[PDB]
Short mmCIF file of C-alpha atoms in Angstrom, two decimals:
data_model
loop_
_atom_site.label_atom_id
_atom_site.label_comp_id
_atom_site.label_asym_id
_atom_site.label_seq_id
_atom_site.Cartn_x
_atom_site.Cartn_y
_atom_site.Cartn_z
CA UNK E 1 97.46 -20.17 -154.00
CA UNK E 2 97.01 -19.80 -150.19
CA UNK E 3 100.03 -18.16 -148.65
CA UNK E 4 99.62 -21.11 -145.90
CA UNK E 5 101.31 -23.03 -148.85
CA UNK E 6 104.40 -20.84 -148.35
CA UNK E 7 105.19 -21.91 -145.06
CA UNK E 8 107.83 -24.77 -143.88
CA UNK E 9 106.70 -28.00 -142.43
CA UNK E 10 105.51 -27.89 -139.03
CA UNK E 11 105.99 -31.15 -136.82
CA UNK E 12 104.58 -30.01 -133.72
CA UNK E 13 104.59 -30.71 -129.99
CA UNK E 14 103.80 -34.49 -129.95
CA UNK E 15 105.82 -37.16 -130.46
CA UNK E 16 104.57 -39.58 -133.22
CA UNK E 17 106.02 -40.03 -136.50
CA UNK E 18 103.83 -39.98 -139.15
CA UNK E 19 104.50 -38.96 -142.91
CA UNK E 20 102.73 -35.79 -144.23
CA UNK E 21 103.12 -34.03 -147.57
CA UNK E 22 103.84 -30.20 -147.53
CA UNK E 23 104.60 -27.79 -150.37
CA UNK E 24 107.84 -26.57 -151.20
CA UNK E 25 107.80 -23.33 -153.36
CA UNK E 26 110.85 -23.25 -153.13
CA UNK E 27 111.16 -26.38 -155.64
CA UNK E 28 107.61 -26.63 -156.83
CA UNK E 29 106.74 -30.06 -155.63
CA UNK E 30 105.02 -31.66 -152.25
CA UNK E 31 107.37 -33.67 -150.35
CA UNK E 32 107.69 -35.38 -147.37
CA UNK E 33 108.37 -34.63 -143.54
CA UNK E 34 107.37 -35.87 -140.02
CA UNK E 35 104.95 -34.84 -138.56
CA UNK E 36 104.39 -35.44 -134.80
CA UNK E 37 100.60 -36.20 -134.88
CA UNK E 38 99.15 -32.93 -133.40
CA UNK E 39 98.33 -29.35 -134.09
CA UNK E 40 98.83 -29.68 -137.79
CA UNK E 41 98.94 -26.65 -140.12
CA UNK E 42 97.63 -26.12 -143.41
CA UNK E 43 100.63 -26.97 -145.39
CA UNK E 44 100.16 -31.05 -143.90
CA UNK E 45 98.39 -33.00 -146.28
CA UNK E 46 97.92 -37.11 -145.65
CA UNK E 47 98.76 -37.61 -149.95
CA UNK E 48 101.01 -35.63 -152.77
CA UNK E 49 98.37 -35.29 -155.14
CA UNK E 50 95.98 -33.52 -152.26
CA UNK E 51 98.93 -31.71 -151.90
CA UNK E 52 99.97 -30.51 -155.39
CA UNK E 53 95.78 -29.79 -155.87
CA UNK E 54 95.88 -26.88 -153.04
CA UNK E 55 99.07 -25.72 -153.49
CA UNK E 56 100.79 -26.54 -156.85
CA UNK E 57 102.30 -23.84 -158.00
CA UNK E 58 102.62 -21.21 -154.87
CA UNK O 1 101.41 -58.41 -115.99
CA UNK O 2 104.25 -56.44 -115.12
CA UNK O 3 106.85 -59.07 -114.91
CA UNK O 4 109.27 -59.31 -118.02
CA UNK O 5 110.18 -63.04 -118.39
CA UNK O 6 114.11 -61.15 -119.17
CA UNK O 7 114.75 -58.89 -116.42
CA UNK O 8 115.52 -55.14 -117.81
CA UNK O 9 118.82 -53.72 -117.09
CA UNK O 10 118.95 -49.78 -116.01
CA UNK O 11 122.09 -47.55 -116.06
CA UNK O 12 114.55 -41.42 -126.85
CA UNK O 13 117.34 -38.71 -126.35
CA UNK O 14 120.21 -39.86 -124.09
CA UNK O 15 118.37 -43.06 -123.15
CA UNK O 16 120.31 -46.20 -123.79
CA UNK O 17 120.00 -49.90 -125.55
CA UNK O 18 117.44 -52.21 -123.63
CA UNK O 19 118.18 -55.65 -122.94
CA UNK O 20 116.68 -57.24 -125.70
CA UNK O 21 112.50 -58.54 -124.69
CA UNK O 22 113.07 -56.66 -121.48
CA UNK O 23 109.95 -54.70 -121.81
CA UNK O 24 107.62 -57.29 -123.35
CA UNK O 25 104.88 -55.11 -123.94
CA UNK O 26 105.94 -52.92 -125.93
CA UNK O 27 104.55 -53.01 -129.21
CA UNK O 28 105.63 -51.18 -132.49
CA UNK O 29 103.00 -49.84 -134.30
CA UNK O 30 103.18 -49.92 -138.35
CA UNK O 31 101.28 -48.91 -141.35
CA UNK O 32 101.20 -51.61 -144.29
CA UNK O 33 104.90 -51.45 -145.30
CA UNK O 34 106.61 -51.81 -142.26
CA UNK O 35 107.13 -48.26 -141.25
CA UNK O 36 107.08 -47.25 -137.58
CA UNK O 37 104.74 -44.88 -136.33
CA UNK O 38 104.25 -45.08 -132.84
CA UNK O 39 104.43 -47.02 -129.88
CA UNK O 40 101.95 -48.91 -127.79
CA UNK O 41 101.60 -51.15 -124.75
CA UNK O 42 99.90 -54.78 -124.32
CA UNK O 43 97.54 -55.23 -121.55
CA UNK O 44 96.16 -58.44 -122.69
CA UNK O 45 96.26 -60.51 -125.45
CA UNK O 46 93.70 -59.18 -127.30
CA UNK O 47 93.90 -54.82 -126.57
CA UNK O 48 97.15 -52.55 -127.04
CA UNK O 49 97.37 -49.18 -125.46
CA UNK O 50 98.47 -46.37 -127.41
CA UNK O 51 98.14 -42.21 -127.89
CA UNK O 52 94.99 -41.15 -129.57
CA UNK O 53 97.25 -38.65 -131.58
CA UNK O 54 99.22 -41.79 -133.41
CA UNK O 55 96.00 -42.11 -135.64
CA UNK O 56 95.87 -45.96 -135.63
CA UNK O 57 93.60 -47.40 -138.33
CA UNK O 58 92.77 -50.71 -138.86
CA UNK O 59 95.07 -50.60 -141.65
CA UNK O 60 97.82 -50.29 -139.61
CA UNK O 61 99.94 -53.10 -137.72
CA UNK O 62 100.96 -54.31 -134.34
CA UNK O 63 104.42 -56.07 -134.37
CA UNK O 64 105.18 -57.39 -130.97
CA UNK O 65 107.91 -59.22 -129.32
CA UNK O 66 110.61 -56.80 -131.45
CA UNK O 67 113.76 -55.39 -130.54
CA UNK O 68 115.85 -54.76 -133.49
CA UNK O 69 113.60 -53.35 -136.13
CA UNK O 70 116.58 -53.54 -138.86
CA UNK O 71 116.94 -57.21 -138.35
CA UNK O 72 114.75 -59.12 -140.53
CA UNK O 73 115.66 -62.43 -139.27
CA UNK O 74 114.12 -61.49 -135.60
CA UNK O 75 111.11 -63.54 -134.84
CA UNK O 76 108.26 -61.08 -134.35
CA UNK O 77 104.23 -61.31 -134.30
CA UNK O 78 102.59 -59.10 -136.93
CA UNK O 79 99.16 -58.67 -135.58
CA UNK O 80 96.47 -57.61 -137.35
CA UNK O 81 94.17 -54.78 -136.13
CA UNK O 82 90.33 -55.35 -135.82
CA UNK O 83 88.74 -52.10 -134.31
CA UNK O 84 90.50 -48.68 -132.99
CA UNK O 85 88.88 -47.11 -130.17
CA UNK O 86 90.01 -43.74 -129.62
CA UNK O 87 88.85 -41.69 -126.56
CA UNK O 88 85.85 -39.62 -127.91
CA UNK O 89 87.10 -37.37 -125.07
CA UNK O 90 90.61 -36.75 -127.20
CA UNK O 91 90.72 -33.18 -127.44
CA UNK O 92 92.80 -32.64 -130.61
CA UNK O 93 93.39 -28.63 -129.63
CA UNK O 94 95.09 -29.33 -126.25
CA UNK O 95 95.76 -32.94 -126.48
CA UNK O 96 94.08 -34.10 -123.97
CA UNK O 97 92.51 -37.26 -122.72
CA UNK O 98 95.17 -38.56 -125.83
CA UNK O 99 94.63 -42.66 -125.43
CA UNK O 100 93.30 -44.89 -127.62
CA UNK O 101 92.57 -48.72 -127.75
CA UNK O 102 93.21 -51.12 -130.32
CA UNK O 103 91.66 -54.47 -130.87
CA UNK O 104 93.30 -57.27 -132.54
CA UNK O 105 92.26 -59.83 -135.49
CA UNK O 106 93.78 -62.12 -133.80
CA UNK O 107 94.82 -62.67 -130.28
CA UNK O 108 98.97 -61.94 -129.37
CA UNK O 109 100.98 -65.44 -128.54
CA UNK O 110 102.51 -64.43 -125.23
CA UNK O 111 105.74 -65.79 -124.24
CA UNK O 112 109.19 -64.68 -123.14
CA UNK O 113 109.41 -61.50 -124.94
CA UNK O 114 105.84 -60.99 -125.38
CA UNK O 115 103.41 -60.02 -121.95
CA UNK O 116 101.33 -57.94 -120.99
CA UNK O 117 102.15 -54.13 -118.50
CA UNK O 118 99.76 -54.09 -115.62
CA UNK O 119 97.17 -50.91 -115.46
CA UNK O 120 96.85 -49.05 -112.38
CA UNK O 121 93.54 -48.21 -110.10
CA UNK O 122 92.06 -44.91 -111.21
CA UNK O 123 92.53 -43.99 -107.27
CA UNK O 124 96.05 -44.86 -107.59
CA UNK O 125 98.99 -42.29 -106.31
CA UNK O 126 101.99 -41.99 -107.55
CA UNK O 127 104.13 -39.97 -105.69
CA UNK O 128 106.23 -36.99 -107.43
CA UNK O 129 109.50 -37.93 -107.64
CA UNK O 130 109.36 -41.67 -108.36
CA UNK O 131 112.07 -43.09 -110.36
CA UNK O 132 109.92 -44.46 -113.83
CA UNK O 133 111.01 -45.88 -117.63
CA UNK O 134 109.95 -45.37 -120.60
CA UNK O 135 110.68 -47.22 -123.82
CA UNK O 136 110.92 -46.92 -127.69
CA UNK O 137 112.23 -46.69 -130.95
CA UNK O 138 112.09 -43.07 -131.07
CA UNK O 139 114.73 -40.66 -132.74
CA UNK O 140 118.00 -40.15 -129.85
CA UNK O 141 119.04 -36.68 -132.19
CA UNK O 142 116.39 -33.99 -132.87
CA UNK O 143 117.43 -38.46 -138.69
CA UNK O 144 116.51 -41.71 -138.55
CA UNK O 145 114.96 -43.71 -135.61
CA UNK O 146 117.65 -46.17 -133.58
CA UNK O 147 117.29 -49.58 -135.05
CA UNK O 148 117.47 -51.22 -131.32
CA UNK O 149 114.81 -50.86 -128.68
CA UNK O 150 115.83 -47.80 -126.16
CA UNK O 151 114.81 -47.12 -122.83
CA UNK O 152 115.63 -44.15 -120.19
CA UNK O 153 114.73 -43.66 -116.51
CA UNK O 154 113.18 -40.68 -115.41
CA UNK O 155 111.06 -38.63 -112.05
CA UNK O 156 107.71 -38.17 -112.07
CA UNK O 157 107.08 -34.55 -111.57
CA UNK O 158 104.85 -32.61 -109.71
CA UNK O 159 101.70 -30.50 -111.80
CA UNK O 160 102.69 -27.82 -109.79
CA UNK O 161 106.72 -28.12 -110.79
CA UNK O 162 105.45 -28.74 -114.87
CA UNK O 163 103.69 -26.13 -114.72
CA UNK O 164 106.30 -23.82 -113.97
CA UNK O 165 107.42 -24.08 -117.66
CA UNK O 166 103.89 -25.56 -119.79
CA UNK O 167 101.82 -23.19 -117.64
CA UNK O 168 98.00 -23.80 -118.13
CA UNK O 169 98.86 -26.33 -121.41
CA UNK O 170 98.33 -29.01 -118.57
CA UNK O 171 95.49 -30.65 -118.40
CA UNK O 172 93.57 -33.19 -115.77
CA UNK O 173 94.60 -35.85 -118.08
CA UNK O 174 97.94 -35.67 -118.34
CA UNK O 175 101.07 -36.35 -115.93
CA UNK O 176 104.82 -34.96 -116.62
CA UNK O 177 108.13 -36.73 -116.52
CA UNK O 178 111.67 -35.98 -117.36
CA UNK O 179 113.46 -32.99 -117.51
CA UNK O 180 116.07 -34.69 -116.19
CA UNK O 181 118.66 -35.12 -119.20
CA UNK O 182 116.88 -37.75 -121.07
CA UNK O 183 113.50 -36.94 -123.36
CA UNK O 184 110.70 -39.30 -125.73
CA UNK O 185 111.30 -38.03 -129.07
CA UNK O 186 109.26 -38.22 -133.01
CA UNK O 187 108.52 -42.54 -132.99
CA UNK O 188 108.19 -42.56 -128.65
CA UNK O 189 104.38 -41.33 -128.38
CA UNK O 190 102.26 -44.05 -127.66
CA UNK O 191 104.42 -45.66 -126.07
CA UNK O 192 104.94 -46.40 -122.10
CA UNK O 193 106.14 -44.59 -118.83
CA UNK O 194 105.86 -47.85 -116.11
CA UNK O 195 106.81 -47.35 -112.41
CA UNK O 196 106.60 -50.49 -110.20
CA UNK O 197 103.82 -50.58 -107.93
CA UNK O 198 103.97 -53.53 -105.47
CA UNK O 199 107.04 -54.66 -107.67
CA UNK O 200 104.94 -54.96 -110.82
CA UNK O 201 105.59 -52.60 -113.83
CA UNK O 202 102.35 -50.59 -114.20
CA UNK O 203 101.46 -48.18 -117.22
CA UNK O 204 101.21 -44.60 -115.58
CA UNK O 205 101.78 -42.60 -118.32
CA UNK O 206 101.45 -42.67 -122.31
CA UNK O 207 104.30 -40.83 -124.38
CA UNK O 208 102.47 -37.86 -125.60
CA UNK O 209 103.92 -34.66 -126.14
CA UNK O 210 106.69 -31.84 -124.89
CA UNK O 211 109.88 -29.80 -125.96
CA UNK O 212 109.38 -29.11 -129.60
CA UNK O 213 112.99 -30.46 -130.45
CA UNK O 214 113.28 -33.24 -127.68
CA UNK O 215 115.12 -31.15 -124.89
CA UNK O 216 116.05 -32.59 -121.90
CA UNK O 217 115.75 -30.14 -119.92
CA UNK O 218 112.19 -29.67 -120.08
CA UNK O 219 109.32 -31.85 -118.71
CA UNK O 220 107.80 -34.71 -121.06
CA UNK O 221 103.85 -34.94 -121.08
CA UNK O 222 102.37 -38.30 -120.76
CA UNK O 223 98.46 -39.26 -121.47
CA UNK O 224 97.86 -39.65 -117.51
CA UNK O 225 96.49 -43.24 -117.08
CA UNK O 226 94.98 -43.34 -113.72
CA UNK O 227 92.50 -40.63 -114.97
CA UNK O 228 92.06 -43.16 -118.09
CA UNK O 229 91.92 -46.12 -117.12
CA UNK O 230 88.37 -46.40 -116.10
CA UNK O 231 87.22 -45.53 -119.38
CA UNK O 232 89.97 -48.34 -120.82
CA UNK O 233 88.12 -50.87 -118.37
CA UNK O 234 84.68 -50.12 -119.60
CA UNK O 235 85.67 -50.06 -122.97
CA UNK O 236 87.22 -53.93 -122.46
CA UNK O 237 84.20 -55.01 -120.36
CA UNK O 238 82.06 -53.66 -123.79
CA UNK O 239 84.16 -55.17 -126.15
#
């Protein structure tokens, strides 16, 4: 899996509060965070199952 | 515009509890199960103001005339969304030009907790320094978002004094406030930054972006309005 998929959640710089999926190797499931509507990264998908298809089991 | 019905009461990290429909424009914005997003601002009946970044759909949900989201006895106006227009100018790498406008389904019933913020001239000036509010349900800790509608006063401040920390990050569109012990956190953006003009509370800014975990010792970025608002005009006139 990409190693993008190994990295923690990333909020960002702006100030909304929107929930994103990211992968959590560290359990083996997608789960939720904030993210602040800008300058996503990779691990920031908009469902779980996108989620779990690019990065289930990292 | 620009005149709350209920008169605010001065004196969001370290901001404080706003006298409930104070700020009459303010809007929270929701997707389909009640969850708060963003902010936005009424200008009219018919258009809210709001950060391009919040990604508004038409899915989404205008509740206006709010103050205590974790009342659900509170008379509020869920308003449905017809059409998003977001700047095609947004620039999603350095955020800016970040404003968007949404269209309601059905027109907003204005009354004593529900009005509309006045919008400034594009040739308006205002001067660094000026004492200005902003409003919202945004997180007070860098948790959960305050149930109660919060507000905070704050200086506009000079490009050249925000650039001494966010360097060439600022752009043409964009104005800075704060860094003066309060900050717009995660739920703010969106949302307003009014200063009176003439005595009327006028949108100047739109809560954008800044400190990465809400300090308040750094300057907030705000979608600047004056450099916005023509396009918000012509997009009303075609609409």
């Amino acid at each position: 899996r990409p190693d993008f998929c190994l990295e923690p959640p990333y909020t960002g710089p702006c100030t909304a509060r929107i929930i994103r999926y990211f992968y959590n190797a560290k359990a083996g499931l997608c789960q939720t965070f904030v993210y602040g509507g800008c300058r996503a990264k990779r691990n920031n998908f908009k469902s779980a199952e996108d989620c779990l298809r690019t990065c289930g089991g990292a | 515009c620009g005149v709350p019905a209920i008169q605010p009461v001065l004196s969001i990290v370290n901001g404080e509890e706003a006298v409930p429909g104070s700020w009459p424009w303010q809007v929270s914005l929701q997707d389909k199960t009640g969850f708060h997003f963003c902010g936005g601002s009424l200008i009219n009946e018919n258009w809210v103001v709001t950060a391009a970044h919040c990604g508004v759909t038409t899915s989404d949900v205008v509740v206006a005339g709010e103050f205590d989201q974790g009342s659900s006895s509170e008379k509020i106006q869920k308003l449905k969304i017809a059409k998003v227009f977001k700047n095609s100018k947004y620039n999603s790498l350095t955020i800016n030009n970040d404003i968007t406008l949404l269209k309601l389904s059905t027109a907003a019933s204005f009354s004593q907790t529900v009005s509309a913020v006045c919008l400034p001239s594009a040739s308006d000036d205002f001067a660094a320094g000026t004492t200005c509010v902003t409003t919202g349900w945004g997180l007070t800790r860098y948790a959960n978002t305050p149930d109660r509608l919060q507000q905070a006063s704050l200086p506009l401040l000079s490009n050249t004094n925000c650039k001494k920390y966010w360097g060439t990050k600022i752009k043409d569109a964009m104005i800075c406030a704060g860094a003066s012990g309060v900050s717009s956190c995660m739920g703010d953006s969106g949302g307003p930054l009014v200063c009176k003009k003439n005595g009327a509370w006028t949108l100047v800014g739109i809560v954008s972006w800044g400190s990465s975990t809400c300090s308040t010792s750094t300057p907030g970025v705000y979608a600047r309005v004056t450099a916005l608002v023509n396009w918000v005009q012509q997009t009303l006139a075609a609409n």
